[PDB]
Design an enzyme around this catalytic site. Structure first.
Site, PDB file in Angstrom:
ATOM      1  N   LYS A  51      41.607 -75.739 -14.977  1.00 39.12           N
ATOM      2  CA  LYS A  51      41.880 -77.296 -15.356  1.00 39.12           C
ATOM      3  C   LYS A  51      42.289 -77.537 -16.670  1.00 39.12           C
ATOM      4  CE  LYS A  51      39.726 -81.735 -14.781  1.00 39.12           C
ATOM      5  NZ  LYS A  51      40.665 -82.319 -15.946  1.00 39.12           N
ATOM      6  N   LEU A  53      44.523 -75.918 -18.205  1.00 34.17           N
ATOM      7  CA  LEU A  53      46.067 -75.837 -18.193  1.00 34.17           C
ATOM      8  C   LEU A  53      46.469 -77.324 -17.716  1.00 34.17           C
ATOM      9  CD1 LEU A  53      46.555 -72.369 -16.424  1.00 34.17           C
ATOM     10  CD2 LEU A  53      46.143 -72.785 -18.847  1.00 34.17           C
ATOM     11  N   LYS A  63      40.181 -76.876  -5.488  1.00 34.29           N
ATOM     12  CA  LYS A  63      41.014 -76.077  -4.543  1.00 34.29           C
ATOM     13  C   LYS A  63      40.865 -74.614  -4.837  1.00 34.29           C
ATOM     14  CE  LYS A  63      43.924 -79.204  -1.882  1.00 34.29           C
ATOM     15  NZ  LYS A  63      43.301 -80.316  -2.408  1.00 34.29           N
ATOM     16  N   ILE A  97      68.824 -77.684   7.070  1.00 39.78           N
ATOM     17  CA  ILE A  97      67.748 -78.542   7.764  1.00 39.78           C
ATOM     18  C   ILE A  97      66.853 -78.937   6.651  1.00 39.78           C
ATOM     19  CG2 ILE A  97      66.003 -78.524   9.694  1.00 39.78           C
ATOM     20  CD1 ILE A  97      67.486 -76.664  11.132  1.00 39.78           C
ATOM     21  N   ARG A 140      66.399 -60.833  -0.105  1.00 41.60           N
ATOM     22  CA  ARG A 140      66.881 -60.769  -1.593  1.00 41.60           C
ATOM     23  C   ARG A 140      68.025 -59.986  -1.782  1.00 41.60           C
ATOM     24  NH1 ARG A 140      63.892 -64.360  -4.430  1.00 41.60           N
ATOM     25  NH2 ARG A 140      65.019 -63.442  -6.437  1.00 41.60           N
ATOM     26  N   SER A 171      69.345 -67.000 -11.605  1.00 39.00           N
ATOM     27  CA  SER A 171      68.168 -65.730 -11.670  1.00 39.00           C
ATOM     28  C   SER A 171      68.762 -64.532 -12.214  1.00 39.00           C
ATOM     29  CB  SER A 171      67.396 -65.493 -10.540  1.00 39.00           C
ATOM     30  OG  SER A 171      68.523 -65.270  -9.489  1.00 39.00           O
ATOM     31  N   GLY A 180      68.167 -64.774  -5.235  1.00 39.63           N
ATOM     32  CA  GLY A 180      68.272 -65.142  -4.137  1.00 39.63           C
ATOM     33  C   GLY A 180      69.423 -65.401  -3.357  1.00 39.63           C
TER      34      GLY A 180
HETATM   35 MG   LIG Z   1      70.500 -68.623  -7.712  1.00 43.77          MG
END
Ligand SMILES: [Mg+2]
Ligand SMILES: [Ca+2]
Ligand SMILES: [Mg+2]
Ligand SMILES: [Mg+2]
Length: 326
Positions: A51, A53, A63, A97, A140, A171, A180
């Site tokens: 907490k 942070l 949690k 979707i 990936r 990335s 990805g």
């Molecule tokens: Mg990308």
DNA sequence: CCGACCGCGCATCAGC
DNA sequence: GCTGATGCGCG
DNA sequence: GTCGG
């Protein structure tokens, strides 16, 4: 992966709020907490510790205590057990979707991969390609393959017009060992903020790449943004490579630095950076950085000669791409 | 408390 | 056909 | 869900 259990729980909570609750601000709250925790260089021993942070508040701290104590979260256990929530979460994994369509399909009794396959007629073009390559798009891309893909795109673009410049961002530019998808930032001197001297600049590149059978499908396409599918060529007798997502963005040449800052990301980094910009009295998009007036209206574009200039305006020390993976 | 949470391209639809 | 809203997606 | 003022 020091705190992988916690960041995984928060990411699952984020996805639920986005996909099921359609509560985008909660989605962002969980993602922010996950990101701040992922970069925290200590193994977290308590919610109190967490907490401290920024982005981790009372609820997430509670949690984290439950998760550390038991290795699970009752809230999530229940969510996983729920048929409507699980079905909606699943369907949103298909490209095209989102939360609204997923819930609509679930209403109509379409809630499994099998159901989708039998109801292609109910899908739009984007969704049909998303379903076609559902499996592949979850895989990936090893950096080794990204490098081969880079070689193909850069060389094919050069063949079209030697004045194009293609830069692989996302990335990959952040130095990731896997990606990805592939994100390509494209410029050409004929297209600037001042004028468009040649039409079909994006089109001609997309066409060349389809001609050599690199680009295989199109999800969406306009004058400045292509989203689609590509595949590396494979040798005699060998299994084909998986189909991959590719995004191409044509940016005015004089706005390259804002464009590459945007397209390099990460997404959370961009959100953090843009928010800080506002706090400093600027607004940033992929084209420009502009001062905000006393009223809060964007002024004229400020001069930018490097990514670092943008950091400088908002009084941030420069961060290399590899340090923007938030 | 409470508003304020980035910024935008393309596809699709409603209303005209 | 156009304009505006919305959904989805990009980082 | 978080938090700055
Ligand atoms: Mg990308
Ligand atoms: Ca993404
Ligand atoms: Mg991404
Ligand atoms: Mg992408």
């Amino acid at each position: 992966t020091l705190n992988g259990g916690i960041t995984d729980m928060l990411t699952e909570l984020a996805n639920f709020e986005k996909n099921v609750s359609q509560a985008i601000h909660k989605y962002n709250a969980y993602r922010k907490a996950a990101s701040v925790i992922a970069k925290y260089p200590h193994k977290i021993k308590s919610g109190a510790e967490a907490k401290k942070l920024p982005g981790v508040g009372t609820k997430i701290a509670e949690k984290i205590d439950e998760f550390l104590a038991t290795g699970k979260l009752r809230k999530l256990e229940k969510i996983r057990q729920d048929d409507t929530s699980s079905s909606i979460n699943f369907l949103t994994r298909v490209s095209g979707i989102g939360p609204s369509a997923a819930r609509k399909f679930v209403d109509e009794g379409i809630k499994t991969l099998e159901d989708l396959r039998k109801n292609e007629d109910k899908l739009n073009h984007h969704q049909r390609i998303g379903l076609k390559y559902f499996g592949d798009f979850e895989k990936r891309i090893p950096r080794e393959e990204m490098l081969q893909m880079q070689d193909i795109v850069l060389n094919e673009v050069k063949k079209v017009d030697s004045e194009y410049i293609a830069t692989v961002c996302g990335s990959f530019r952040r130095g990731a060992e896997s990606s990805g998808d592939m994100d390509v930032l494209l410029t050409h001197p004929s297209f600037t903020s001042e004028s468009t001297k040649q039409p079909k600049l994006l089109h001609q590149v997309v066409e060349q790449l389809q001609k050599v059978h690199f680009i295989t499908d199109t999800l969406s396409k306009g004058e400045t943004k292509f989203m689609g599918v590509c595949q590396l060529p494979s040798k005699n007798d060998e299994k084909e490579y998986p189909h991959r997502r590719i995004d191409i963005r044509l940016i005015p040449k004089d706005q390259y630095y804002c464009g590459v800052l945007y397209f390099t990301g990460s997404d959370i980094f961009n959100k953090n950076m843009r928010a800080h910009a506002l706090e400093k009295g600027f607004t940033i998009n992929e084209y420009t950085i502009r001062p905000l007036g006393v009223t809060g209206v964007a002024g004229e574009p400020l001069p930018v000669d490097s990514e670092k200039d943008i950091f400088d305006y908002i009084q941030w020390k420069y961060r290399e791409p590899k340090d923007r993976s938030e």
